[PDB]
């Protein structure tokens, strides 16, 4: 931790003495006798367990619609909207995702 | 072929059709706030509850 | 004078002059196109073995 | 006391973060391990992940590990993966010719100011790219012949 | 548990070395190639850590199939870090009977002075090195590595006469390439590359090694 001297006001660093170590400083004569036990306990931040990302569980969060996809004739599919600048004028595009045994991703 | 202000107009049955949807949306949205406050929304993907 | 590629693309085909997503031409479309432009009622049909 | 946490106990110091992705199908389930690092030689040579089936994103590292011929294929897949994310469509040989342009002479050369000097050997075209008089005076100093072709 | 993983990792690199010596062109019997773990434990024991399966016994002699009076030496250094005299005594142990080509499978990091001393002299004796960590998977058939085949000069001249070009015209490849160091080709050699495809077929390409 941070410990200062009461006389001068500077900091102290532990050094070796004659028989045992002592708290001394290089600014003014001041020695403190080391006693039975002084101890500082710290609690470093531990790490947690990581989660598995991806899967249909997270895909159920986003809501889907009813539009057929011409790959396997399956009506269930996810639709999203996006803004894109075309060559002539602004144009809103839709991203299509097939929620089936094939699972394709299209952009029309 | 022409367009006017009559083509784009709210329908009679359309005003109350979206009103109930907006009301249900707000009624579902003002509950997740207190759910987050007291502690709820068990998140499956690794992320922040916010 | 250094050679870059032995054959452009692998077959030497212009991507501009192509019919279908990478293909030279579609054969079923040409098939049923020639099937109707040249009707030959007098000529009879034949089996697969011949 | 401030480097005890810094001392790594296990793993690869290169890889930072790893997450497992779940793939679903008709009835089968698959688990794919995607990590975020650069040293592929160490992760692919592991007991867990199959070293046979593994794809990377760094072209320089994949040409250092696999080879120069295997880097021309991964540089085409990344370009096509970016073109289908925009709703566009390009031809296969259009990018196959560009991938073979920086693969025929040596290693994977980039289209920069330094790589263009390694590709072409004309000082006149570099006169517009470079600065006040450096190349112009070094040309008169060395005395090389420029071919007008 | 660590010793089992060590035994598995060393069996893996042994299998890769055997596959390399097999597809290089040497005469290797199939029984040694596809050796099972139960059969591998019968010729060398698992325990202890560095006792019975010592690197002094891990030293095999490969026989060239084309030339009968031609054999290659290949072994593993005993100590992890390579030295200067430990490889000298080994290459002199290899030089004494009938061997001129030897392979060292290095276990840990290398020494630059050792590499320099090895690259200085190459009159008839050549020493090639291979890291143990990188030799844990076959690089030839990984996912997208096109099949490479070493050609002969009688076909090189025919290929030159076919397209009417020079050796400089042929695209060159690096000699410090994993595939090039795998097949072990020196300067002035062409390699045939077969590129498969699922739309038309497979294309043929020719490359030079520098
Ligand atoms: Zn003091
Ligand atoms: Zn589908």
Swiss-Prot record, chain A:
SMART domains: RPOL9, ZnF_C2C2. GO terms for cellular component: cytosol; nucleoplasm; RNA polymerase III complex. A motif (Hairpin) lies at residues 88-89. It comes from the Eukaryota. Keywords: Antiviral defense, Disease variant, DNA-directed RNA polymerase, Immunity, Innate immunity, Leukodystrophy, Metal-binding, Neurodegeneration, Nucleus, Transcription, Zinc, Zinc-finger. Core component of RNA polymerase III (Pol III) which synthesizes small non-coding RNAs using the four ribonucleoside triphosphates as substrates. Can mediate Pol I proofreading of the nascent RNA transcript. Anchors into the Pol III active site to constantly monitor transcription fidelity, cleaves mis-incorporated 5'-ribonucleotides and restarts the transcription process. Once Pol III reaches the poly(dT) termination signal, can induce Pol III clamp opening and transcription termination. Component of the RNA polymerase III complex consisting of 17 subunits: a ten-subunit horseshoe-shaped catalytic core composed of POLR3A/RPC1, POLR3B/RPC2, POLR1C/RPAC1, POLR1D/RPAC2, POLR3K/RPC10, POLR2E/RPABC1, POLR2F/RPABC2, POLR2H/RPABC3, POLR2K/RPABC4 and POLR2L/RPABC5; a mobile stalk composed of two subunits POLR3H/RPC8 and CRCP/RPC9, protruding from the core and functioning primarily in transcription initiation; and additional subunits homologous to general transcription factors of the RNA polymerase II machinery, POLR3C/RPC3-POLR3F/RPC6-POLR3G/RPC7 heterotrimer required for transcription initiation and POLR3D/RPC4-POLR3E/RPC5 heterodimer involved in both transcription initiation and termination. This is DNA-directed RNA polymerase III subunit RPC10. It comes from Homo sapiens (Human).
Curated annotation (Swiss-Prot), chain D:
DNA template strand binds at residues 113, 131. Catalytic core component of RNA polymerase III (Pol III), a DNA-dependent RNA polymerase which synthesizes small non-coding RNAs using the four ribonucleoside triphosphates as substrates. Synthesizes 5S rRNA, snRNAs, tRNAs and miRNAs from at least 500 distinct genomic loci. Pol III-mediated transcription cycle proceeds through transcription initiation, transcription elongation and transcription termination stages. During transcription initiation, Pol III is recruited to DNA promoters type I, II or III with the help of general transcription factors and other specific initiation factors. It is linked to Leukodystrophy, hypomyelinating, 7, with or without oligodontia and/or hypogonadotropic hypogonadism: An autosomal recessive neurodegenerative disorder characterized by childhood onset of progressive motor decline manifest as spasticity, ataxia, tremor, and cerebellar signs, as well as mild cognitive regression. Other features may include hypodontia or oligodontia and hypogonadotropic hypogonadism. There is considerable inter- and intrafamilial variability. The chain holds residues 1193 to 1341 of 1390 of the full protein. It is found in: Nucleus; Cytoplasm, Cytosol. It comes from Homo sapiens. Expressed in the brain, in the cortex and the white matter (at protein level). This is DNA-directed RNA polymerase III subunit RPC1. It comes from the Eukaryota. Belongs to the RNA polymerase beta' chain family. Disulfide bonds: none annotated.
From Swiss-Prot, chain E:
It comes from Homo sapiens (Human). This is DNA-directed RNA polymerases I, II, and III subunit RPABC1. It holds the Pfam family RNA_pol_Rpb5_N. HAMAP family: RNApol_Rpo5_RPB5 (MF_00025). Component of the RNA polymerase I (Pol I), RNA polymerase II (Pol II) and RNA polymerase III (Pol III) complexes consisting of at least 13, 12 and 17 subunits, respectively. Pol I complex consists of a ten-subunit catalytic core composed of POLR1A/RPA1, POLR1B/RPA2, POLR1C/RPAC1, POLR1D/RPAC2, POLR1H/RPA12, POLR2E/RPABC1, POLR2F/RPABC2, POLR2H/RPABC3, POLR2K/RPABC4 and POLR2L/RPABC5; a mobile stalk subunit POLR1F/RPA43 protruding from the core and additional subunits homologous to general transcription factors POLR1E/RPA49 and POLR1G/RPA34. (Microbial infection) Interacts with HBV protein X. There is a cross-link at residue 81 (Glycyl lysine isopeptide (Lys-Gly) (interchain with G-Cter in SUMO2)). Its main location: nucleus. It is found in: Nucleus; Nucleus, Nucleolus. The lineage of its organism: Eukaryota, Metazoa, Chordata, Craniata, Vertebrata. One of its GO terms (biological process) is tRNA transcription by RNA polymerase III. One of its GO terms (cellular component) is RNA polymerase II, core complex. Belongs to the archaeal Rpo5/eukaryotic RPB5 RNA polymerase subunit family.
């Amino acid at each position: 931790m941070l410990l200062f001297c009461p006389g001068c006001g500077n900091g102290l660093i532990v050094e070796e003495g004659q028989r045992c170590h002592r708290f001394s400083c290089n600014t003014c004569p001041y020695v403190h006798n080391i006693t039975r036990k002084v101890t500082n306990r710290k609690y470093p931040k531990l790490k947690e367990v990581d989660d598995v990302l991806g899967g249909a569980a997270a895909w159920e969060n986003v809501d889907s619609t009813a539009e057929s996809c011409p790959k396997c004739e399956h009506p269930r599919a996810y639709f999203m909207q996006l803004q894109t600048r075309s060559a002539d004028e602004p144009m809103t595009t839709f991203y299509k995702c097939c929620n089936a045994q094939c699972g394709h991703r299209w952009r029309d | 072929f022409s367009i006017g202000i009559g083509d784009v107009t709210p329908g009679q049955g359309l005003l109350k059709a979206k009103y109930e949807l907006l009301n249900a949306g707000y009624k579902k949205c003002d509950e997740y706030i207190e759910a987050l406050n007291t502690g709820k929304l068990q998140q499956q993907p690794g992320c922040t509850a916010e | 004078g250094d050679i870059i590629q032995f054959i452009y693309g692998g077959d030497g085909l212009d991507p501009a002059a192509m019919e279908g997503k990478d293909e030279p031409l579609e054969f079923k479309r040409v098939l049923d196109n020639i099937k109707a432009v040249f009707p030959c009622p007098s000529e009879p049909a034949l089996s697969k073995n011949e | 006391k401030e480097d005890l946490p810094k001392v790594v106990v296990q793993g690869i110091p290169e890889v930072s973060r790893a997450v497992i992705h779940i793939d679903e199908q008709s009835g089968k389930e698959k688990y794919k391990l995607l990590v975020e690092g650069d040293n592929l030689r160490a992760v692919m040579a592991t007991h867990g992940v199959k070293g046979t089936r593994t794809t990377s994103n760094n072209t320089y590292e994949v040409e250092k590990t696999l080879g120069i011929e295997a880097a021309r294929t991964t540089i085409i897949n990344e370009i096509q993966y970016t073109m289908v994310n925009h709703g566009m469509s390009i031809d296969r040989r259009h990018v196959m010719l560009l991938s073979d342009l920086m693969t025929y002479k040596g290693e994977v050369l980039g289209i920069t100011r330094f790589g263009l000097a390694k590709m072409k050997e004309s000082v006149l075209m570099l006169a517009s790219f470079e600065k006040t008089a450096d190349h112009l005076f070094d040309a008169a100093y060395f005395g090389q012949k420029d071919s007008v072709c | 548990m660590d010793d089992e993983e060590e035994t598995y990792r060393l069996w893996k690199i042994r299998k890769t070395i055997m596959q390399l010596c097999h597809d290089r062109g040497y005469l290797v019997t199939q029984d040694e190639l596809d050796q099972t773990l139960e059969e591998f434990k019968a010729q060398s024991g698992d325990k202890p850590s560095e006792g019975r399966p010592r690197r002094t016994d891990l030293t095999v002699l490969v026989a060239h199939n084309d030339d009968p009076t031609d054999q290659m030496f290949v072994f593993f250094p005993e100590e992890p870090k390579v030295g200067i005299k430990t490889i000298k005594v080994y290459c002199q142990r290899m030089q004494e009977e009938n061997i001129t080509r030897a392979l060292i499978v290095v276990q840990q990091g290398m020494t630059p002075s050792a590499k320099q001393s090895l690259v200085d002299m190459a009159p008839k004796y050549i020493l090639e090195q291979f890291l143990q960590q990188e030799l844990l998977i076959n690089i030839t058939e990984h996912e997208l590595v096109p099949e490479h085949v070493v050609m002969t000069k009688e076909e090189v001249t025919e290929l030159l006469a076919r397209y009417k070009l020079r050796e400089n015209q042929l695209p060159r490849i690096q000699a410090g390439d994993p595939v090039a160091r795998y097949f072990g080709i020196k300067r002035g050699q062409v390699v045939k590359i077969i590129r498969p495809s699922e739309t038309a077929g497979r294309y043929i390409t020719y490359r030079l090694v520098q």
